[PDB]
Amino acid sequence: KHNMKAFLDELKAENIKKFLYNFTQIPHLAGTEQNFQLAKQIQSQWKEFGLDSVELAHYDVLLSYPNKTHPNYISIINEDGNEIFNTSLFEPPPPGYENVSDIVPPFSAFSPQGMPEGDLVYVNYARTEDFFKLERDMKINCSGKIVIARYGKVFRGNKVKNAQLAGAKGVILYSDPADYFAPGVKSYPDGWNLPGGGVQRGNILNLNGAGDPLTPGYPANEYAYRRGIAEAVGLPSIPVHPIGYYDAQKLLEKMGGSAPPDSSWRGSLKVPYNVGPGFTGNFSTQKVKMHIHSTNEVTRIYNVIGTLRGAVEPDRYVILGGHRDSWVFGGIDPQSGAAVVHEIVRSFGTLKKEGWRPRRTILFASWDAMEFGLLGSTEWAEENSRLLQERGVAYINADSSIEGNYTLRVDCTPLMYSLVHNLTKELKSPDEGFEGKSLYESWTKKSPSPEFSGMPRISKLGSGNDFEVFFQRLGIASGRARYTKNWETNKFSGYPLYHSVYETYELVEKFYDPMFKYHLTVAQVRGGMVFELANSIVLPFDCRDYAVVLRKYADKIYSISMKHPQEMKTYSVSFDSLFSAVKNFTEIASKFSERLQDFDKSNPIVLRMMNDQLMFLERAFIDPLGLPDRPFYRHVIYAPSSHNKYAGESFPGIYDALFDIESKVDPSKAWGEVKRQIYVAAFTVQAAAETLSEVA
Amino acid sequence: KHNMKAFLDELKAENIKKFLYNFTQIPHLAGTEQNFQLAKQIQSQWKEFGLDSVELAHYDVLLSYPNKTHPNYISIINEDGNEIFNTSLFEPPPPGYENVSDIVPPFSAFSPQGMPEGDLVYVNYARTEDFFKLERDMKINCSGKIVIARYGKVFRGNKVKNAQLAGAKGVILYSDPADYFAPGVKSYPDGWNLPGGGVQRGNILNLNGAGDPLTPGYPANEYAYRRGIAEAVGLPSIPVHPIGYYDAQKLLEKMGGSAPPDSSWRGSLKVPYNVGPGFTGNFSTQKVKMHIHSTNEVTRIYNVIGTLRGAVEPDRYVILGGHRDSWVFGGIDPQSGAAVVHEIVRSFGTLKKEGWRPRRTILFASWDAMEFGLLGSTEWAEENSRLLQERGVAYINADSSIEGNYTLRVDCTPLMYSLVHNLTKELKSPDEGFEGKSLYESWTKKSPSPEFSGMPRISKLGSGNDFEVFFQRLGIASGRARYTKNWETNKFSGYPLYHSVYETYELVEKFYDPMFKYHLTVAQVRGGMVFELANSIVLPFDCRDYAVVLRKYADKIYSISMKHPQEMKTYSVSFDSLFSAVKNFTEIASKFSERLQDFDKSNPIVLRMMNDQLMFLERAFIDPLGLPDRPFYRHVIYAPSSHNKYAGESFPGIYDALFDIESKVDPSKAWGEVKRQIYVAAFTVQAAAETLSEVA
Ligand SMILES: *[C@@H]1O[C@H](CO)[C@@H](O[C@@H]2O[C@H](CO)[C@@H](O[C@@H]3O[C@H](CO[C@H]4O[C@H](CO)[C@@H](O)[C@H](O)[C@@H]4O)[C@@H](O)[C@H](O[C@H]4O[C@H](CO)[C@@H](O)[C@H](O)[C@@H]4O)[C@@H]3O)[C@H](O)[C@H]2NC(C)=O)[C@H](O)[C@H]1NC(C)=O
Ligand SMILES: *[C@@H]1O[C@H](CO)[C@@H](O[C@@H]2O[C@H](CO)[C@@H](O[C@@H]3O[C@H](CO[C@H]4O[C@H](CO)[C@@H](O)[C@H](O)[C@@H]4O)[C@@H](O)[C@H](O[C@H]4O[C@H](CO)[C@@H](O)[C@H](O)[C@@H]4O)[C@@H]3O)[C@H](O)[C@H]2NC(C)=O)[C@H](O)[C@H]1NC(C)=O
Ligand SMILES: *[C@@H]1O[C@H](CO)[C@@H](O[C@@H]2O[C@H](CO)[C@@H](O[C@@H]3O[C@H](CO)[C@@H](O)[C@H](O[C@H]4O[C@H](CO)[C@@H](O)[C@H](O)[C@@H]4O)[C@@H]3O)[C@H](O)[C@H]2NC(C)=O)[C@H](O)[C@H]1NC(C)=O
Ligand SMILES: *[C@@H]1O[C@H](CO)[C@@H](O[C@@H]2O[C@H](CO)[C@@H](O[C@@H]3O[C@H](CO)[C@@H](O)[C@H](O[C@H]4O[C@H](CO)[C@@H](O)[C@H](O)[C@@H]4O)[C@@H]3O)[C@H](O)[C@H]2NC(C)=O)[C@H](O)[C@H]1NC(C)=O
Ligand SMILES: *[C@@H]1O[C@H](CO)[C@@H](O[C@@H]2O[C@H](CO)[C@@H](O[C@@H]3O[C@H](CO)[C@@H](O)[C@H](O)[C@@H]3O)[C@H](O)[C@H]2NC(C)=O)[C@H](O)[C@H]1NC(C)=O
Ligand SMILES: *[C@@H]1O[C@H](CO)[C@@H](O[C@@H]2O[C@H](CO)[C@@H](O[C@@H]3O[C@H](CO)[C@@H](O)[C@H](O)[C@@H]3O)[C@H](O)[C@H]2NC(C)=O)[C@H](O)[C@H]1NC(C)=O
Ligand SMILES: *[C@@H]1O[C@H](CO)[C@@H](O[C@@H]2O[C@H](CO)[C@@H](O)[C@H](O)[C@H]2NC(C)=O)[C@H](O)[C@H]1NC(C)=O
Ligand SMILES: *[C@@H]1O[C@H](CO)[C@@H](O[C@@H]2O[C@H](CO)[C@@H](O)[C@H](O)[C@H]2NC(C)=O)[C@H](O)[C@H]1NC(C)=O
Ligand SMILES: *[C@@H]1O[C@H](CO)[C@@H](O[C@@H]2O[C@H](CO)[C@@H](O)[C@H](O)[C@H]2NC(C)=O)[C@H](O)[C@H]1NC(C)=O
Ligand SMILES: *[C@@H]1O[C@H](CO)[C@@H](O[C@@H]2O[C@H](CO)[C@@H](O)[C@H](O)[C@H]2NC(C)=O)[C@H](O)[C@H]1NC(C)=O
Ligand SMILES: O=C(O)CC[C@H](NS(=O)(=O)N[C@@H](CC(=O)O)C(=O)O)C(=O)O
Ligand SMILES: O=C(O)CC[C@H](NS(=O)(=O)N[C@@H](CC(=O)O)C(=O)O)C(=O)O
Ligand SMILES: *[C@@H]1O[C@H](CO)[C@@H](O)[C@H](O)[C@H]1NC(C)=O
Ligand SMILES: *[C@@H]1O[C@H](CO)[C@@H](O)[C@H](O)[C@H]1NC(C)=O
Ligand SMILES: *[C@@H]1O[C@H](CO)[C@@H](O)[C@H](O)[C@H]1NC(C)=O
Ligand SMILES: *[C@@H]1O[C@H](CO)[C@@H](O)[C@H](O)[C@H]1NC(C)=O
Ligand SMILES: [Ca+2]
Ligand SMILES: [Ca+2]
Ligand SMILES: [Cl-]
Ligand SMILES: [Cl-]
Ligand SMILES: [Zn+2]
Ligand SMILES: [Zn+2]
Ligand SMILES: [Zn+2]
Ligand SMILES: [Zn+2]
């Protein structure tokens, strides 16, 4: 029998291991020859595995690279202009890779060039609230200062935007052991911790969903019009560079001025964590100098797109996509995900060779230039937007399969909650102590829902990954899943060796998943989701789950507003329309569910009518005018946080209208805009509800 | 048998006559009680006629009305400030209506209030080229002048926008006998010509597709956020008022300054047509004073929406819509169209009562507040945009059925050309001399295609009517048809009594269509189109017809650019990408057509897949970012002309980038934008082509 069990059983941990090894022996930096060669390899293998067609889709997009003969570095400079300390020019390479060529040294992708000299101000995590505390409470002025910020808590691009608006003339990012060194664990290569010479690479753009900075709205094809750099989207205006904690200690140890305002500002280094500005009296004349010489350059990138044609509904697309480009070896990010995709394709191809085809078309994608701003996924979606918005059923992302070995993590649209619950009840837990128990059981035990007993936690989608164009721009139901750490065991996000040279095959094989059982579990979750979405006769979405969360989000946004009761009285700010729309959505979704379960099962038109209602329900939350000043974030329920691209925000339009409103100089204008966003949200919720009404 | 012949045969000229009489006895001004009562009557009758549901959809939108106790008028004022001449306060009412109440006096809807006094400048038709001739050639400065412009050639809102940008402080619009008095025809009531006391009403907004000025993007429902007046869309900044030619003669006769530049500037009045500024020497101290006291007010409007559920594809909508509100009696505009719709509903309802249902759902609409800026259609489409863009097959408009008695006029998407040709071959010509011949034959003879022998002329859709939101904002295949005059017999557009009190039932019954045979023919064309669109198994669109016109439009826009060969060399301006996309569209459309004719006819999924490809093809020409500064004009192939809302422009983005480019101060910026619009157009054409490729 060709059923999901046949698909799932075919997946092998040993295959995922072999693919991971294969994908992580050399660097695959976007825009480089090595990453083009891997694209061609993937294309060849997906054909071999049995997909109907496999093509490369290429684009020419703005990328950013250090100058090989003019290295980036930071100095402490004395009053004579002598550089008395210099940060590293490279991370010490790990055992057995000390002769690997083409390792890109640590840099902040898209930094402008410059050599700013000045006094240091320490800004904690450079969050919105961190700058609020400096400027408003501590009365420290960052204008013309170089800021030093620790990585963590929020996307680094938001840190740089915040530093820029504070008037900084440069940003130094560093990894504090507080956030990247788990107590009791040894540094790579003897454990999974970040060594003091390790550095986190990463782009510092603020694209807000635009894709290639030079071609917002349109694919960066051969005849594309490209904005001039000065009009490009999302580029930082001040130089930025990342360093490790050995180097950070040297920059921070001399810092004077004001003491840290409290303990939440102190990391784990043996330094005061003084905010500055500048150094203590003996060193008061020493300054910090950055030297950044990186260049932005239009460069060709290559997505691999594989198609497995649907037998019944070939014009309905279920997409499994993740990126292939890495900063260096990509041992976790992204190759732990790409190896999983590779095995999923191989398994589907095995069934196909035995004569099976899924009901709907499955598209498989190996995206390029993700590390430089989700560029490959976004340019492809811009090219294919009309096909995706009329035919796109769902998008399942496939970046890193692991960031820990504790339990499952799922972030997805409410439309997929029931699908996820049901699938995980059918899968075996790989966890020790849960032998013979379901993944649902271990996941629920280790990651309980904060709201419901006997349910697991499922989070909203944020952003910072390749689902962004599909979900927040185009309104295609999206999901992601991976294995994660125990947040009770160290509160820091992600894994210590993130975006460092130390993220290698050996890191995974030795420390994260020796038996590749967590990889296999994640292949089963991602592949199982794709299988159901593509094969079920009724799409496996439950509209009633959206009704429940809409009420939760309406309560939450109302509660934020109600911290300002006088203003709500003065400006007649009512949430009645939003609650009414949510009530209506709940009622209509309930009746739709009845019809779906009750309709004449022999009638393919009623079924498809009803499958189209399910498919277009996520689409209904799209506002074609976008959110304020963010035209590519069009989903009215979910946007990436304006303060942290990684985090999702609910009712983002109303959230941003309320944020820091007490500080607005024209309260009438400000509360007027709150009311406008309530109207837009209520209307959108009612309009989405009405797509589930009887059609005529 | 229930086939199109049964539907067509049921339509009766005598019924259309009875409905026209019924709809034209009292004024039905938008926002008035009389127009609400007619809405309720229509709703009742459509229910009686047999539709499944008939509801009122209401909105509260900005309308504009004169002040009943503070009349609008224009004066000539002497140096003492004595008003020595005053324009009429009302049009002399026609025979037997001299006691009808609630006739709105002539005014320009949405004029601001004011009493500007100044010297007159005569600006011909106030077209872009007319102001070019004044400012550039004649060196006449309109700043601080009151401009007087004759109606005709272009939409009056464009005249007012042009006057505003020329620095005018007021606009007087008048009907010149050259444009509104056919030689050899007597004035109403003894013929169909405009009498000297007749005046054309009409709104002077520049909405660019926005709908209600206060709620762009969102329906003007009960909880709507409304912009303040100062931020409203499309409102004129200077006072405006319309007059008849008896009054115009008094304002023009004294005009001095420069002579008219040539004969194209002279109308038919016994006056010099001097451009001014101001009056001849003896009257040089006399000035013109406007008195405008109209008020803008948010007012409730009511659309009637009738549904006839489809038997097979209830979630596919074919819409027949036209407006119901009139300026006064609406004898032609709109009731000659509304009576036709009423009879079409009655005929469909007759078939339904005998057990028939169309394959797809038919929606019937009686729109309100069309005369005030397409407000009812636009607000309803804003409310229902998600349903319309995923389910909307086609929109057939139904304003005035007649503007003459000579031949058929059709404006529509290329997708409907074949449908129209085939249907008109099946219909009888009502024309004298063409007894027993088809409508196709008489139409082709009287209105030959400028391009193809043996074919009739079919024009592009422009705007100024209720299809605008459906076609140019949402990308739903749209069409319209009416009987029209012979352009060889008088070149003036429209009919002389347009938007005057004299547009009555008697005008139609006596002078235009005594036997209601032209009305019946138009009911057959509009109803027949709806019947096919709603009932055929394969949608009756031919994608190959779009390929032919795309090549025509590409040639045309290229030819415009090629008037600047040096600049095309300097800035490397190539149209190669657009021609490539058009070639590709042609090739892919040809292969799609083969599959449509060749596919397995027993397979409803392949059929619907292919019906969805046909339905979404118009949709593919939509750009979600809209055209420059016109966010609600989203169709890349067709937009209303930036110089004349009534006219359609092809490749509008490139057209406007090229328009008057030789006058731009930064040719590099200007030609860069031409190249950007070529990229956008080429991409959109290729993307639309790719929706017709095999789906997987
Ligand atoms: C959640 O779902 C419910 C439906 O169960 C929607 O309820 C509608 O709510 C609006 C109010 O926002 C009601 O609007 C009112 O309509 C009255 C006329 O309604 C009749 O006629 C219409 C057609 O014109 C029919 O569709 C309808 O069935 C009724 O027969 C108006 O007279 C009301 O205006 C008067 O009162 C208001 C308030 O005091 C004044 O501001 C006005 O000046 C005026 O005096 C009003 O417009 C609507 O009728 C309800 N429809 C129903 C029950 O079917 C909710 O709107 C929906 N929530 C959201 C957010 O959409
Ligand atoms: C009308 O329809 C035709 C298809 O019949 C489209 O043709 C494509 O045209 C583009 C040019 O605009 C071609 O682009 C070229 O692709 C080359 C690689 O193509 C191969 O590999 C890709 C996957 O990466 C496959 O899809 C493809 O089948 C080929 O096997 C590049 O190497 C070319 O770049 C080089 O030359 C250019 C020009 O000198 C330089 O600027 C570059 O720096 C580089 O040196 C180029 O990108 C594309 O291959 C064609 N596809 C075909 C024939 O299938 C038209 O684009 C389409 N019209 C529009 C407007 O869309
Ligand atoms: C996750 O799994 C849960 C549990 O299986 C699943 O919910 C269940 O779905 C089934 C299938 O729709 C529901 O069964 C229906 O129940 C109603 C009322 O009892 C019946 O009227 C339905 O009968 C009709 O349809 C049948 C085919 O399913 C026909 O055989 C029959 O003739 C009728 O036409 C039907 O049996 C069941 O009630 C729920 N259980 C719950 C909610 O507890 C859920 O759908 C899964 N989630 C997915 C797939 O996303
Ligand atoms: C306007 O009217 C014209 C003239 O009628 C019409 O064009 C015609 O359409 C028919 C129907 O598609 C075409 O007939 C087809 O021709 C090809 C080649 O000869 C055949 O392969 C097709 O046969 C298949 O389909 C048949 C059902 O239609 C099956 O019976 C058969 O088994 C095959 O599956 C088919 O006969 C005809 O060629 C054109 N004539 C032209 C273009 O001159 C046009 O479509 C109408 N426009 C509309 C409806 O918008
Ligand atoms: C990762 O795995 C891939 C796939 O197994 C490896 O690529 C494959 O490498 C072999 C040996 O280089 C290639 O076979 C050889 O082909 C050449 C020319 O066609 C010829 O000399 C011989 O016929 C020989 O068999 C094979 O083509 C190639 N497969 C691809 C790319 O599809 C790759 O080596 C592995 N990478 C690492 C780091 O282990
Ligand atoms: C245009 O045609 C409509 C429809 O025929 C006319 O409206 C109809 O008018 C009659 C007479 O006023 C109404 O019948 C009457 O109803 C009232 C109360 O229900 C009652 O006194 C009697 O039972 C009587 O039969 C009828 O309801 C009404 N139909 C509608 C509106 O649906 C209208 O008079 C015509 N207008 C003109 C200008 O001719
Ligand atoms: C990268 O840095 C190198 C080294 O400074 C630059 O190469 C120099 O370019 C200048 C002109 O700008 C020449 O006069 C020197 O001879 C070059 N030096 C060497 C060592 O080659 C190069 O411009 C930079 N590359 C970029 C900006 O991509
Ligand atoms: C930090 O690096 C800089 C640049 O390489 C070093 O300064 C250079 O030293 C050489 C040799 O003494 C001089 O000829 C250059 O003029 C210097 N360049 C600059 C920009 O200062 C510096 O010695 C290094 N500091 C440490 C502590 O190693
Ligand atoms: C329409 O014009 C009338 C007549 O001038 C206005 O009514 C007057 O309003 C003023 C206050 O603005 C009163 O003092 C007068 O007593 C009113 N006169 C009469 C004759 O009623 C009215 O304001 C205007 N209506 C509008 C603006 O809608
Ligand atoms: C044009 O209309 C104006 C306004 O009605 C007339 O001027 C008014 O005349 C009365 C009576 O003589 C005066 O009391 C008012 O003060 C005047 N108002 C203004 C604004 O001037 C004028 O007489 C009319 N002109 C003609 C030729 O009939
Ligand atoms: O440009 C963007 O939006 C983000 C690109 C890139 N995304 S990412 O966070 O590294 N990708 C992954 C990292 C991981 O797979 O662990 C995630 O979503 O967790 C980054 O943050 O540098
Ligand atoms: O606001 C608008 O866009 C136009 C509203 C209104 N349209 S209209 O030209 O009068 N409608 C008709 C007039 C007619 O049916 O003769 C048309 O399309 O020809 C007008 O021009 O005043
Ligand atoms: C910070 O300093 C700069 C001048 O060096 C000044 O423009 C800015 O207003 C200052 N910020 C404060 C104190 O608000
Ligand atoms: C793997 O699991 C064990 C058991 O909790 C844990 O001690 C170890 O830290 C985990 N490894 C990683 C890399 O999280
Ligand atoms: C027209 O006159 C006004 C001043 O009355 C002036 O601002 C404007 O520039 C003039 N236009 C010309 C002559 O270009
Ligand atoms: C009706 O047709 C006749 C014949 O051409 C023509 O003389 C007359 O002017 C027409 N009436 C109108 C209102 O166009
Ligand atoms: Ca782009
Ligand atoms: Ca609106
Ligand atoms: Cl992921
Ligand atoms: Cl019309
Ligand atoms: Zn990644
Ligand atoms: Zn990454
Ligand atoms: Zn009209
Ligand atoms: Zn009109």
UniProtKB/Swiss-Prot annotation, chains A, B:
Keyword Glycoprotein: yes
Glycosylation sites: N22, N67, N86, N99, N141, N282, N405, N422, N584
Pfam family, one: TFR_dimer
Binding residues annotated for Zn(2+) 1, in chain numbering: H323, D333, D399
Main location: membrane
Keyword tags: Calcium, Carboxypeptidase, Cell membrane, Cytoplasm, Dipeptidase, Glycoprotein, Hydrolase, Membrane, Metal-binding, Metalloprotease, Multifunctional enzyme, Phosphoprotein, Protease, Signal-anchor, Transmembrane, Transmembrane helix, Zinc
The record's account of how the chain is modified after translation: The first two amino acids at the N-terminus of isoform PSMA' appear to be cleaved by limited proteolysis. The N-terminus is blocked.
Catalytic residues, chain numbering: M370 (nucleophile), S574 (charge relay system), D612 (charge relay system), H635 (charge relay system)
Binding site for Ca(2+): T215, Y218, E379, E382
Cellular-component GO terms for this entry: cell surface; cytoplasm; extracellular exosome; membrane; plasma membrane
Reported impact of D333N: No effect on enzyme activity
GO molecular-function terms, A-Z: Ac-Asp-Glu binding; carboxypeptidase activity; dipeptidase activity; metal ion binding; metallocarboxypeptidase activity; peptidase activity; tetrahydrofolyl-poly(glutamate) polymer binding
Impact noted for substituting D399Q: Reduces enzyme activity
Induction info: In the prostate, up-regulated in response to androgen deprivation.
Bound cofactor: record note: Binds 2 Zn(2+) ions per subunit. Required for NAALADase activity.
Segments of this protein annotated with the region NAALADase: 220-533
pH dependence: Stable at pH greater than 6.5.
Extracellular side: 1-696
The protein's required cofactors: Zn(2+)
Record's comment describing the protein's domains: The NAALADase activity is found in the central region, the dipeptidyl peptidase IV type activity in the C-terminal.
Assigned protein family: Belongs to the peptidase M28 family. M28B subfamily.
Subunit structure: Homodimer.
Protein name: Glutamate carboxypeptidase 2
Species name: Homo sapiens (Human)
High-level lineage: Eukaryota, Metazoa, Chordata, Craniata, Vertebrata
